[PDB]
Amino acid sequence: AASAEVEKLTVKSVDPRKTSQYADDYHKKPADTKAFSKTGGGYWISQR
Amino acid sequence: GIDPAQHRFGAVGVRKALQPGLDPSLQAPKVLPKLHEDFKATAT
Amino acid sequence: TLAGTSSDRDAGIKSGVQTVKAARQARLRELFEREALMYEKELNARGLSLVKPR
Amino acid sequence: REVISIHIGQAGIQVGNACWELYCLEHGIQPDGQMPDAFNTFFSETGAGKHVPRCIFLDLEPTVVDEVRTGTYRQLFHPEQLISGKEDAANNFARGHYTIGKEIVDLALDRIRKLADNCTGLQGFLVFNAVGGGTGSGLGSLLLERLSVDYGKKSKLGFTVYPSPQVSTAVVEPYNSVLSTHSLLEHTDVAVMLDNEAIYDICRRSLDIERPTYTNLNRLIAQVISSLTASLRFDGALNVDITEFQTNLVPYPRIHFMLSSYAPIISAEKAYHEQLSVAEITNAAFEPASMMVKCDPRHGKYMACCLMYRGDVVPKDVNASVATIKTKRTIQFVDWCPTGFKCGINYQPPTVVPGGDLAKVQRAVCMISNSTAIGEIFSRLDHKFDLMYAKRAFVHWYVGEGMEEGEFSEAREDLAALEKDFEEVGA
Amino acid sequence: NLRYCFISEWLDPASGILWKYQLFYYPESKEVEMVDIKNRRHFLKRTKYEELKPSLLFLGSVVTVFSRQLKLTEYGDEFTRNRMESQSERTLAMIKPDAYKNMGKIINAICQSGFLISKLRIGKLSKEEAGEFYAVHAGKPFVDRLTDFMSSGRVVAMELVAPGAIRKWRELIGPTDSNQARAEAPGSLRAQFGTDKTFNACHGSDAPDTAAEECNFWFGPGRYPGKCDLAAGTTLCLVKPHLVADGAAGLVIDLIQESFEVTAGGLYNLDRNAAAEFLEVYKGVLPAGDFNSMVEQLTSGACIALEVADRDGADAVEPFRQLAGPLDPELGRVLRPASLRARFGLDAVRNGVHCTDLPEDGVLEVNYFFTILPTA
Amino acid sequence: MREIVHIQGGQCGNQIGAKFWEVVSDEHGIDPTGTYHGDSDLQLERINVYFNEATGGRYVPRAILMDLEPGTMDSVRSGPYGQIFRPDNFVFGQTGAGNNWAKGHYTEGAELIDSVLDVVRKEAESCDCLQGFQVCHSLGGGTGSGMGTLLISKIREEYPDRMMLTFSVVPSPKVSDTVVEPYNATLSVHQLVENADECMVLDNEALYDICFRTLKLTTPTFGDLNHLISAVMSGITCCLRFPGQLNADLRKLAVNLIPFPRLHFFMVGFTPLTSRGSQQYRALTVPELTQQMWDAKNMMCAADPRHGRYLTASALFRGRMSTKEVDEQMLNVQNKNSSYFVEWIPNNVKSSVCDIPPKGLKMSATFIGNSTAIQEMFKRVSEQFTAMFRRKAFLHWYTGEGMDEMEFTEAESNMNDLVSEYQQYQ
Amino acid sequence: MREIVHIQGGQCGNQIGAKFWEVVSDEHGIDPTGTYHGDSDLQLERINVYFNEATGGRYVPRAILMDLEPGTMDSVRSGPYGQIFRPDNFVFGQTGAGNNWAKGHYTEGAELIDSVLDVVRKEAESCDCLQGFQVCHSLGGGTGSGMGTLLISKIREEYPDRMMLTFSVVPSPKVSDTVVEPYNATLSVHQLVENADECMVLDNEALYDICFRTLKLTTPTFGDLNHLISAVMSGITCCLRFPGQLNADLRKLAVNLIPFPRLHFFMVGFTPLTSRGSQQYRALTVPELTQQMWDAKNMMCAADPRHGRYLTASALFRGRMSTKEVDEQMLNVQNKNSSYFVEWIPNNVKSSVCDIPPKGLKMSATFIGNSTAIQEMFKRVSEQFTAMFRRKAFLHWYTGEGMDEMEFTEAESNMNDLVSEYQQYQ
Ligand SMILES: Nc1nc2c(ncn2[C@@H]2O[C@H](COP(=O)(O)OP(=O)(O)OP(=O)(O)O)[C@@H](O)[C@H]2O)c(=O)[nH]1
Numbered sequence A: 001a002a003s004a005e006v007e008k009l010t011v012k013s014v015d016p017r018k019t020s021q022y023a024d025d026y027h028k029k030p031a032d033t034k035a036f037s038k039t040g041g042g043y044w045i046s047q048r
Numbered sequence B: 001g002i003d004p005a006q007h008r009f010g011a012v013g014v015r016k017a018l019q020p021g022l023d024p025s026l027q028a029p030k031v032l033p034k035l036h037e038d039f040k041a042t043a044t
Numbered sequence C: 001t002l003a004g005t006s007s008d009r010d011a012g013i014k015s016g017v018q019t020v021k022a023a024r025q026a027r028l029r030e031l032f033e034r035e036a037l038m039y040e041k042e043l044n045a046r047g048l049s050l051v052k053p054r
Numbered sequence D: 001r002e003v004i005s006i007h008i009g010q011a012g013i014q015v016g017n018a019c020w021e022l023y024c025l026e027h028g029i030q031p032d033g034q035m036p037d038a039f040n041t042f043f044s045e046t047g048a049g050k051h052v053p054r055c056i057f058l059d060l061e062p063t064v065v066d067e068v069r070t071g072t073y074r075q076l077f078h079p080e081q082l083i084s085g086k087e088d089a090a091n092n093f094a095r096g097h098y099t100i101g102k103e104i105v106d107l108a109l110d111r112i113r114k115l116a117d118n119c120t121g122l123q124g125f126l127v128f129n130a131v132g133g134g135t136g137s138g139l140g141s142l143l144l145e146r147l148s149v150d151y152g153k154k155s156k157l158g159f160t161v162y163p164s165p166q167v168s169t170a171v172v173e174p175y176n177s178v179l180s181t182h183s184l185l186e187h188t189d190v191a192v193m194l195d196n197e198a199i200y201d202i203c204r205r206s207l208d209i210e211r212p213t214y215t216n217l218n219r220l221i222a223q224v225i226s227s228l229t230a231s232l233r234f235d236g237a238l239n240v241d242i243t244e245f246q247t248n249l250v251p252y253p254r255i256h257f258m259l260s261s262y263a264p265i266i267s268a269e270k271a272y273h274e275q276l277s278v279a280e281i282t283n284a285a286f287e288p289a290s291m292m293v294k295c296d297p298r299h300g301k302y303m304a305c306c307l308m309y310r311g312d313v314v315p316k317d318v319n320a321s322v323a324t325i326k327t328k329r330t331i332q333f334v335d336w337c338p339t340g341f342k343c344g345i346n347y348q349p350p351t352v353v354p355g356g357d358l359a360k361v362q363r364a365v366c367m368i369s370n371s372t373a374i375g376e377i378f379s380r381l382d383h384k385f386d387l388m389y390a391k392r393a394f395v396h397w398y399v400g401e402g403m404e405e406g407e408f409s410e411a412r413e414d415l416a417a418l419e420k421d422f423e424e425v426g427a
Numbered sequence E: 001n002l003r004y005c006f007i008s009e010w011l012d013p014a015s016g017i018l019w020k021y022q023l024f025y026y027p028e029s030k031e032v033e034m035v036d037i038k039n040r041r042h043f044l045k046r047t048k049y050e051e052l053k054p055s056l057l058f059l060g061s062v063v064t065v066f067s068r069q070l071k072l073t074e075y076g077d078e079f080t081r082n083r084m085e086s087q088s089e090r091t092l093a094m095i096k097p098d099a100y101k102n103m104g105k106i107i108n109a110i111c112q113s114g115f116l117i118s119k120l121r122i123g124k125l126s127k128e129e130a131g132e133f134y135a136v137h138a139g140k141p142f143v144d145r146l147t148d149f150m151s152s153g154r155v156v157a158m159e160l161v162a163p164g165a166i167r168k169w170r171e172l173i174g175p176t177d178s179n180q181a182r183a184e185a186p187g188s189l190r191a192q193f194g195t196d197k198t199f200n201a202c203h204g205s206d207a208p209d210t211a212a213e214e215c216n217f218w219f220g221p222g223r224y225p226g227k228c229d230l231a232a233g234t235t236l237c238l239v240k241p242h243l244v245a246d247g248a249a250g251l252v253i254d255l256i257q258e259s260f261e262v263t264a265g266g267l268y269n270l271d272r273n274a275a276a277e278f279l280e281v282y283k284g285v286l287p288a289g290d291f292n293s294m295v296e297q298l299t300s301g302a303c304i305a306l307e308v309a310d311r312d313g314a315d316a317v318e319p320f321r322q323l324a325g326p327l328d329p330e331l332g333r334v335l336r337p338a339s340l341r342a343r344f345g346l347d348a349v350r351n352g353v354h355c356t357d358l359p360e361d362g363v364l365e366v367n368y369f370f371t372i373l374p375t376a
Numbered sequence F, G: 001m002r003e004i005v006h007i008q009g010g011q012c013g014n015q016i017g018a019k020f021w022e023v024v025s026d027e028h029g030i031d032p033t034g035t036y037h038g039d040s041d042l043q044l045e046r047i048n049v050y051f052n053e054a055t056g057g058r059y060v061p062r063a064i065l066m067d068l069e070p071g072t073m074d075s076v077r078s079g080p081y082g083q084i085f086r087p088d089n090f091v092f093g094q095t096g097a098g099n100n101w102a103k104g105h106y107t108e109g110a111e112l113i114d115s116v117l118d119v120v121r122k123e124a125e126s127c128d129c130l131q132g133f134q135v136c137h138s139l140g141g142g143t144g145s146g147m148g149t150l151l152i153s154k155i156r157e158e159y160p161d162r163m164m165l166t167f168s169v170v171p172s173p174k175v176s177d178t179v180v181e182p183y184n185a186t187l188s189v190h191q192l193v194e195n196a197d198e199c200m201v202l203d204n205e206a207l208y209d210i211c212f213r214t215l216k217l218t219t220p221t222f223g224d225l226n227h228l229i230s231a232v233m234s235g236i237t238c239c240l241r242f243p244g245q246l247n248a249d250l251r252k253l254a255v256n257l258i259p260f261p262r263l264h265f266f267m268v269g270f271t272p273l274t275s276r277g278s279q280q281y282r283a284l285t286v287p288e289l290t291q292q293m294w295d296a297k298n299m300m301c302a303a304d305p306r307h308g309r310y311l312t313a314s315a316l317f318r319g320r321m322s323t324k325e326v327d328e329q330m331l332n333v334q335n336k337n338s339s340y341f342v343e344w345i346p347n348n349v350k351s352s353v354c355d356i357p358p359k360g361l362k363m364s365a366t367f368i369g370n371s372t373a374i375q376e377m378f379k380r381v382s383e384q385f386t387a388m389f390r391r392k393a394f395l396h397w398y399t400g401e402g403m404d405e406m407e408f409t410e411a412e413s414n415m416n417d418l419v420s421e422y423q424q425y426q
């Protein structure tokens, strides 16, 4: 198994799941949102 | 060992079966073989 | 301040005691997360493991 | 160019609760309301360092609404747009359309008025609801009516969730469905069907989640909606706005029902598995194993299709692929529309949600078609309606609310007219 | 049938009026009943509590029934009188600073030989504080120098309740001259931990009335004499009702006194509203267990709590946490056998000792537990 | 917001209500002293459905006791969570009906019902938006059946737009307390089919069968059976007090379950029920819960569901579960045993999921089936009734108090046309 | 994945199954408390065939014990590896049949078989894809033969598409326990030839002779006999539980060994079996195993195979071997003793290799031969049946319970036509 996934599982071992599905799933850490930028999706076309 | 007069003659909960999370005896062992859990993490 | 006024309960702002209690809970959770990440390695040093929820 | 989005019912506001999560994650907005012009179609910038969405959640039971008022996105909508009633309509079309509607619709449309007034370049509306329930069906139909008499000329994108054939969680949803279509015909402009069992099979087969909750379903539905509006939000090589679906996809004043699909719906390890390119995703967009409505398009003939491409897509290979599609003979078109396609290409790739199940792919496809399998779906619903109505079951709840048998008979013959229209158009 | 009756009083949690609940306890069926003294009406019917030790109930004791802790002020019946005339013998068995360094073994010996500790308190006495004590011995110059010795170290004072309690304690102490006690009986506690006749490790009241007065001096109604709480560099440890009941308090405190300096400790039988506050931060975590169950076990009985401080005086939180080991007794027993939670912690919620967990948190818990609860 | 008031009638109803308020208080985390000491903030948010804060976080139940003997009042101040109640709400007679339906409906009713109507009026107008009323009583007793039944009549005459739940135990011949059980049950049924919206039929026979077989207990005292019915009632009204991924209020459950205005007698069950010796050997999955739900030995009525058909059914799940798993299980059950369900209604099984399990359990269920097998129970009651009525036994204490024979013939008519129409839809 | 449920009937069946589950749990490395403690990962992927994960590594066997007298169940819970079964799987009567086939098939069956059918059903749909059922019972006793036989009939009627193994011991006059042995065996075999898919015949006489000659034991208790039968049963099922260079499932062996629908009575052997004094003096090669395998004194039936011909034969090997050596050894055995094989079927030997040996051994084998020497056993039994039935001894304890005489004549005719067609194909 992936080491990071195993680490995430042992992290979730401590949470009691005493909250609702909504909060437990839609929770976000402040570092989860990346600032907006021109990614390499389809932007190499217009940057010629 | 019976006093013929004072002795009482003749032959003499469900929460525990309902909410077993509180029961201290019925629990997970909480320590398992590493090989077993490494199989389980990919299996389940 | 210790508690809120009458307008705080309507504005939804939590009182001082409530906010300090919540923050304390969460800091504690962080500490125990670190401790669990330590105990997992200490167990795999022996060959045993923690049980993980499903 | 600005568009507002209303959410009616237990299902609609959860789907929207995934949509707005997706939007803030795409535009780099923190859920607390600030960033650390492309957003302008959704978020109005009030004052400074704050963006509030152009939407209204509304429902009659307060439990799911104040679950939002206490969830993570408290600071996004403050508590005055989230309209909440006191008691539920409880799967009762008449109760939602006449009893509680008459007290909630005025406040709702009074709020939507000053939302539109804050807006300046209003494109259209898009609504979110499931027709099986009571609130989403009844007062949704009442709301669409009053909005159509309000503006009329503006496009209304109805993304409805229909009942799946065999997997179903209610009992009277045939009654509520039929009563919903009777108004959804003559009110909305472009109505997109999204069933549940097709999504279940999708996450079972491709994404291989074997225990999927509602979060995963609403997550990928939000991906489809986001892929629909990416042409309005971001600049691409070939942009397509909301007014195009009105012309390109609806050949008749009453035939507006659209099956959606999406590709590549791929997990985090099958992405490394598969070599991703444009030809195969253009293929994968057309097999019934990746459609959002459980129906067989092999049985039907396509009327018109639309293809939203996102990411690393050049136009030569999408042209080559649709050339291969039109020359294949496993699918068939109608003899009316030789130009059966409408491409659209945008530069931004779809984003990932941390804790989600989808990986960061370079490109993606949202297919939206029009066919006659939908005419088959409505007949499937009409049959199971007629069986229960044959014994007059559950009727006394509706009459007890204050409705009668007349609207039942006329909605029945209305769908009968719709069935005739689809079968004559198929010829 | 047999019935033991006591008027107990119970102040409630948010309308201040105290009042008597009279209580009937049946030993044969382990059954407790309650009828309010005022209003002539029943409060609690013939229900099986069976959670109160019959030995534990005595005059002035505090027992919690159905989430209300009501101390038994005094019995009503003369039958109950004779029956509890037997048990309710109280004495003040305080210790001297020379033996304070090894008091864990002493308390172990005490409760393992057989006794009851009702109330326990550690303090440091000022000169006027030691002179307030020993009031009867004011004329003796021997005692006038004793008081200066006594004012030096940290003293411990415990109330012992037992059948024949005054006599058993005057027995187990041994004569005041510890040298002659060493010669006479090695099992005597004074002979075991005594230096000189001038210095005796343990002091025992010789009269019931004298004990009743010194007990009042030490922990009277509003009296909290010689409080000695050092907030800086200290941690809080809770000896739980499990250990209080079984008597492993001596087994734990000597062990922790071996590694750290122990400063301030008391027997606090909390109310539910105090336990909720003290604990309320561990409801987020799942290793601790149900918050409601964990709080319930803590209110189910008396508990000791000591201020632990380290030799170096830098910080005691981390070293004491390594000493305490994991939060679960199973995890401790597997990978930290030297931990005391592993040593005598039964299971998840019946763990032996509770401990502070954060450096920002140690002094907060300590000053709370030793100023806030005690003042109230 | 949505409001439920609770009414307890008769000795059996009062003791059931006592255990019910015990279980509810435990789920919301308030101690018997009336203060809040729970953990999750999900508990604070919907306690207005059952409680009112009085002065500083003190929650009194929104319940009305109703009886005729003080011995019941002692037995409800008996247990803990007994002092939590409302002293004024102890509206209470003094004579005692004593297993006489006429005494509970004509004599003592005339002097007690005005008082209970006033106090229930105060409890109704104390809150803003009523959802419904919830009464717990019996069908065999006198002070429970007749008094509570008139109470139901006067209330439906007062508030005709609110829901009504009635937890009613029904007599069975194997476990039969009194001898006039059919004389009271038939009249209770006669009035309930025209007044109440739906009724949850219970019985002690099935409860003892459960406690013997699946619980493997030794001594199931009455506190246990009341604990089981309490867990059932908490499972029914969990969707109002707790958020879920698919919400189902009381009226929503009623309109999904009741196809005809007279077809509203439900059989109920609960899951999981495990013996403490075999609890460790069992897994916790949705199919594990379903295989015990649809077991006929787990129903709480003396009505074998495989002796008839289901008209509709409902399954309220508690705990974080997979929705796809919920629906596929209901579909598989509906497809395998295809003959045991009614034909002319598609998808007879409505379901709902809540995120909050009961305390101590990881994942629980509550089944409510509106089957046609209830006609067997009404038949086994009506036969006892007509056997006694052919010889007019025990009739004089009833007719001599104000009642007449025509009422008994009307009860026969309504019971009989009722069971004929269940047979019609069978 | 592919699933095998276990059904144990009667006293012998329960004690055999006890040893069987001891040795299987030993192979998969689970301790007698029910948790995993093995070392290799190979054991984990194929415990789903014989177990169900309950909670935290709690693997309960997919077994069902069934009898009529609590002595056997107590002896099951007494020994080790008795604490791992699910107590709900201890489906169990109270009266006791006691060597009366009519008691085991007509009276006590009517109230035990519905219950065992309930639990075996619930245990069948608990898994996804059934491979078949596996029943261990006797043909001499009453509660084993009769009850197990009816269970086989009910099961083959419900799930006719799944495989079925029956390990059945038969009585012999030399080791004779009871008096009604032919009255039991004849009727059970009469029912097995139309219900069971295949049967593995055992007998205590050959086992005693094996422990005398080859094992050279002093006191051959029942523990070792059941120990040998367990090793046989683990040997036949090892293919599913472990990978191998050539895998042979249950249906694969059936279609390889059964040429005609009534020719399905197998005799079994086992290798290696060596005395402890000579345990280290021996070698471990495939020829060494083959010599001990094809020996006539190693069969586990009282039927000398050299008095007949093998219709077919099969050998399942366990351990690291070279299939070239395996196949040439089979070829040598078929070429040398060419008279002992049938002519009109070439290459009468099916083989298979699995790469995991049993615990403590380097290499083992399991022989399954469908020969025609079994007709000696059935003539040996049927002649005793005729000797008793011709003068109607003991007949009335059967006729007085529901059975009639034509059933006995039916079993006679079916036994006779079976042995005649065996003699025909010889
Ligand atoms: N895709 C999706 N569908 C949902 C979700 N929640 C509910 N539904 C569907 O909604 C249909 C019923 O309507 P609901 O939205 O649940 O309830 P409602 O429309 O508000 O009507 P009321 O229950 O009377 O308030 C069901 O058939 C569900 O399949 C969801 O989270 N995602």
Ligand SMILES: Nc1nc2c(ncn2[C@@H]2O[C@H](COP(=O)(O)OP(=O)(O)O)[C@@H](O)[C@H]2O)c(=O)[nH]1
Binding pocket: F009, F010, F011, F012, F013, F015, F016, F098, F099, F138, F140, F141, F142, F143, F144, F145, F169, F175, F176, F177, F178, F204, F222, F223, F225, F226
């Ligand atoms: N489950 C349960 N049933 C009860 C209890 N007490 C009485 N009953 C039932 O009530 C029936 C008699 O009705 P009763 O309680 O006397 O009604 P009442 O006289 O009007 O109050 C009997 O058949 C009992 O089975 C109880 O504590 N629990």
Ligand SMILES: Nc1nc2c(ncn2[C@@H]2O[C@H](COP(=O)(O)OP(=O)(O)O)[C@@H](O)[C@H]2O)c(=O)[nH]1
Binding pocket: G009, G010, G011, G012, G013, G015, G016, G067, G098, G099, G138, G140, G141, G142, G143, G144, G145, G169, G171, G176, G177, G178, G204, G222, G223, G225, G226
């Ligand atoms: N191998 C073996 N055979 C047994 C054992 N117990 C009994 N038997 C045989 O089984 C026959 C009796 O079967 P029995 O157990 O009485 O069957 P039941 O009465 O129907 O349960 C006897 O001929 C024994 O040889 C055992 O433990 N091992």
Ligand SMILES: [Mg+2]
Binding pocket: D009, D010, D011, D133, D134, D135, D136
């Ligand atoms: Mg809804």
